[PDB]
Design a protein around this ligand. Structure first.
Ligand SMILES: [Mg+2]
Length: 187
């Protein structure tokens, strides 16, 4: 079984949001979701950090797909990637939100910029590592220094980086990595 938490940058720079929910749809529809199968929770970060839903909120794929479609962009003026990932680690992956004893933890992080809470990102990744959270990270290169941005997001991805890290040209391109992402998550 797998407990998957998808951690989405929902700040204003992310656009169009319908591409992000499309990526959610395409990704989730490759999964059997339920209490003895895969679970998904989703965290949105920006000016707030919000649990769109918990890991144990939904017991079928059909239910998750309907929920994901109603996730709206909550906005924000900065890239709060440290805060998002840490909130996911410390809160989404808890027993009270459906994390299952002994079940492997998996995080999928999607953003388009270098983080403004950059100082503490190394610490957050360090904690995730100690808690054996497998991390997939996705950098959206163009919005409607890229190098430092890319290397930051690469640095969130688990080893091997070549399997855990993705970059795409824009939000519309997120659906194009879903198949590979899905295969890799299930190893
Ligand atoms: Mg932003």
């Amino acid at each position: 079984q797998l407990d998957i938490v998808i951690v989405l940058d929902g700040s204003n720079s992310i656009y169009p949001w319908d591409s992000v929910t499309a990526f959610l749809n395409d990704l989730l529809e490759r999964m059997d979701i339920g209490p003895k199968q895969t679970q998904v929770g989703i965290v949105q970060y920006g000016e707030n950090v919000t649990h769109e839903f918990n890991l144990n909120k939904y017991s079928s794929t059909e239910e998750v797909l309907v929920a994901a479609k109603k996730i709206v962009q909550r906005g924000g003026r900065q890239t709060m990637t440290a805060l998002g990932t840490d909130t996911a680690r410390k809160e989404a992956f808890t027993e009270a939100r459906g994390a299952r004893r002994g079940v492997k933890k998996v995080m999928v992080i999607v953003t388009d910029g270098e983080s403004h809470d950059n100082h503490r990102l190394k610490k957050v990744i360090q904690d995730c590592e100690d808690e054996n959270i497998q991390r997939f990270s996705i950098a959206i290169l163009g919005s409607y220094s890229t190098e430092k941005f890319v290397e930051e997001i690469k640095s969130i991805a688990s080893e091997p980086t070549e399997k855990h890290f993705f970059n795409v040209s824009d939000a519309l391109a997120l659906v194009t990595i879903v198949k590979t992402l899905g295969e890799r998550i299930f190893a």
